Design a protein around this ligand. Structure first.
Ligand SMILES: CCCCCCCCOCCOCCOCCOCCO
Ligand SMILES: CCCCCCCCOCCOCCOCCOCCO
Ligand SMILES: CCCCCCCCOCCOCCOCCOCCO
Ligand SMILES: CCCCCCCCOCCOCCOCCOCCO
Ligand SMILES: CCCCCCCCOCCOCCOCCOCCO
Ligand SMILES: CCCCCCCCOCCOCCOCCOCCO
Ligand SMILES: [Ca+2]
Ligand SMILES: [Ca+2]
Ligand SMILES: [Ca+2]
Ligand SMILES: [Ca+2]
Length: 576
């Protein structure tokens, strides 16, 4: 699709969004045959994701060079629950079987959404309009197994129902470990089992007035090393929507409750984390000329259990923000903007804002200037942990960005450079065994994308340069590749749909924890290749297969944790 929602909360056509943005749909994923959300995001511009091995293992998403907690991940609009305890997003446990759509807008959006939107935003949408029931599942190269039953149907005039179950499981391959593990080893394939359940009830009172109720949860258990971690999550949403010709409005609610254990192996000696986050937001938008204007109020409650986050007492964190959005188109120029004020139960008030203007100085070509401001809340652990500091302020970012975007000779392209200066970075002082706000980073980047067709061939290429450094010491930051290259090539032929995807993961610096003291290591970086194919046996059956890492490239995204290697997958789906 070409109209997202994530930018200002309500539908608008992407072309109207001045910030770089990307959309992935459910048809994409099925094609891509992704078995995990990281797989999907790893493909898109500006994304650098690392992982302690295969599937289920902790992972980190760095967008355009920012720390891993500097990305806001929303599910169906709402701040990712899993991110709550740690103050940092990791989709590693989120069920891909719930993903219907994803919308990703890079750059700051705190001025719309609050804390965490620094690098950009990620909005995983779990909703579809696609009636019928579908059965599917697959088999693969490490006992990977999956099966899943889905269906959406009508329940009479104006009400529709959605139901879904899915179970995927693939014991692993040992992810060695290094640094961690200590004395012995872990000669054991570290599996992950995920079982999901999802149900939605959508209701139109009228042609404009709508309503819904969803409920979903998953029970995961993905063993790691140097320990089996068992995770339960459930979330609940319900809202009303009015969508008129001129006036749009939404009122939304949600509650998610998570329980994240790790044993064992076999009680006593295990840290359970438990969070309950409560959200209510109200937002309006109206069409005004060739533009819109908008505002909403947005409230949050997160309360944690004692022991959670390795923090002494339970905590009850509250936040309320209020913001204003605008888009106007005039003549050849475009203006878009937002401003927010947030009142946090801990640090108080902090406001934020962004503007961008574009000039289409010649048909099909557009020059865009953006300046935007964002923030990142301190987390429990910096606040109330053994080394805590309850008076921390938020970490603060300023970004400037220029772009040229245009359609020339059958090819759509864009090229941006941004600068991101982060400040008040929450860092630990050995001197006082406390955290304080003090660090700086400067990030210097370049994104270039392009898609275009040449015969039955479709190309979708992207390139990123990230110079992310500690601004005081002038040194590169770790865990981040300076350069990635991503290319997808799609084409059909006889009745076979093909896709080859190529990635080059640049060279990164990390640390070697196997042993103290902990030395920095330079990882060379590689090229990876996956190949995929599907074929409609009938009109109802489609069979696919995939070779991932088609050559057998050995590499790590995190020093010491072994990655998959070449895996095979054979899969199918049956719609009726
Ligand atoms: C009705 C409020 C519209 C602006 C809300 C966000 C504005 C935040 O800073 C924007 C101002 O700085 C540049 C002003 O010129 C264009 C503002 O953006 C036009 C919004 O469509
Ligand atoms: C919706 C429009 C919001 C406009 C945001 C941009 C304007 C921000 O003003 C200046 C930013 O820094 C604010 C402090 O102003 C100067 C502080 O000087 C006094 C120091 O004690
Ligand atoms: C309708 C809600 C309006 C939200 C706009 C405020 C967003 C944050 O303010 C703009 C950026 O921050 C500038 C404010 O910082 C200066 C604070 O000045 C406070 C002096 O009381
Ligand atoms: C940084 C981006 C620079 C953009 C320069 C584009 C300027 C003009 O580009 C296209 C102009 O059209 C001429 C190219 O071929 C014309 C095709 O039109 C067919 C009949 O005239
Ligand atoms: C308008 C898009 C800028 C195009 C990037 C390639 C051309 C660069 O020209 C000079 C190179 O600048 C060196 C810095 O490179 C990274 C800087 O990125 C953004 C920091 O301002
Ligand atoms: C990129 C400079 C040329 C002007 C834009 C060309 C359109 C780019 O589309 C292709 C992008 O795919 C890889 C681009 O690599 C070229 C630029 O990398 C330069 C970094 O300074
Ligand atoms: Ca192991
Ligand atoms: Ca193990
Ligand atoms: Ca035009
Ligand atoms: Ca120091």
């Amino acid at each position: 699709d070409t109209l997202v929602v994530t930018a200002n909360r309500f539908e608008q056509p992407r072309s109207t969004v001045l910030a770089p943005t990307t959309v992935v749909t459910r048809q994409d994923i099925d094609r891509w045959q992704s078995t995990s959300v990281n797989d999907v995001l790893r493909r898109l511009p500006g994304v650098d994701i690392t992982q302690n091995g295969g599937s289920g293992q902790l992972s980190s998403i760095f967008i355009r060079g920012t720390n891993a907690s500097h990305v806001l991940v929303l599910i169906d609009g709402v701040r990712l629950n899993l991110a709550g305890v740690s103050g940092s997003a990791d989709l590693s446990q989120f069920p891909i079987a719930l993903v219907q759509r994803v919308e990703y807008i890079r750059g700051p959006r705190s001025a719309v959404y609050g804390s965490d939107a620094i690098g950009g935003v990620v909005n995983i949408i779990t909703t579809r309009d696609e009636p019928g029931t579908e059965i599917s599942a697959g088999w693969g190269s490490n006992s990977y197994q999956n099966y899943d039953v889905s269906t959406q149907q009508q329940l009479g005039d104006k009400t529709r129902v959605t139901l879904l179950g899915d179970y995927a499981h693939t014991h692993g391959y040992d992810v060695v470990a290094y640094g961690n593990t200590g004395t012995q080893a872990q000669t054991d394939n570290d599996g992950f089992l995920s079982k999901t359940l999802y149900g939605a009830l959508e209701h139109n009172f009228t042609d404009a007035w709508s309503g819904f109720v969803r409920g979903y949860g998953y029970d995961n258990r993905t063993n790691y090393d140097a320990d089996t971690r068992k995770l339960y999550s459930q979330s609940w949403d319900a809202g009303l929507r009015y969508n008129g010709e001129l006036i749009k409005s939404q009122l939304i609610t949600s509650y998610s409750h998570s329980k994240d254990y790790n044993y064992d192996p076999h009680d006593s000696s295990a840290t359970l984390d438990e969070m309950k986050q409560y959200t209510v937001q109200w937002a309006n938008n109206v069409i005004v000329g060739h533009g819109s204007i908008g505002a909403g109020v947005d409230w949050q409650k997160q309360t944690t259990t004692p022991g959670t986050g390795y923090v002494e007492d339970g905590y009850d964190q509250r936040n309320t923000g209020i913001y204003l959005t605008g888009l106007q188109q005039v003549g050849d120029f475009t203006f878009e903007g937002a401003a927010r004020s947030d009142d946090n139960s801990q640090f108080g008030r902090h406001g934020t804002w962004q503007t961008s203007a574009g000039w289409e100085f010649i048909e099909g070509y557009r020059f865009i200037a953006s300046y935007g401001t964002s923030y990142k809340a301190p987390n429990l652990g910096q606040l109330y942990g053994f080394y805590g500091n309850p008076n921390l302020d938020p970490e603060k970012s300023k970004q400037w960005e220029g772009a040229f975007e245009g359609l020339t000779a059958g090819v759509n392209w864009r090229i941006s450079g941004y600068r991101n200066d982060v400040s008040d970075l929450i860092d630990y002082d050995d001197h006082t065994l406390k955290y304080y706000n003090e660090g700086k980073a400067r990030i210097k980047g370049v994104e270039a994308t392009a898609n275009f067709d040449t015969g039955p061939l479709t190309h979708t290429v992207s390139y990123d340069y990230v110079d992310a450094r500690n601004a005081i010491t002038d040194t590169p930051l770790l865990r981040r590749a300076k350069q990635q290259v991503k290319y997808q090539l799609d084409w059909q032929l006889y009745d076979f749909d093909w896709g080859i995807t190529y990635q080059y993961l640049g060279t990164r610096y990390d640390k070697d924890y196997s042993s103290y003291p902990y030395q920095t290591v330079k990882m060379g970086g590689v090229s990876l290749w996956d190949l995929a194919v599907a074929y409609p046996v009938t009109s109802h059956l489609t069979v696919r297969g995939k070779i991932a890492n088609l050559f057998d490239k050995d590499y790590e995204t995190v020093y010491g944790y072994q990655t998959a290697g070449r895996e095979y997958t054979l899969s199918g789906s049956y719609t009726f």
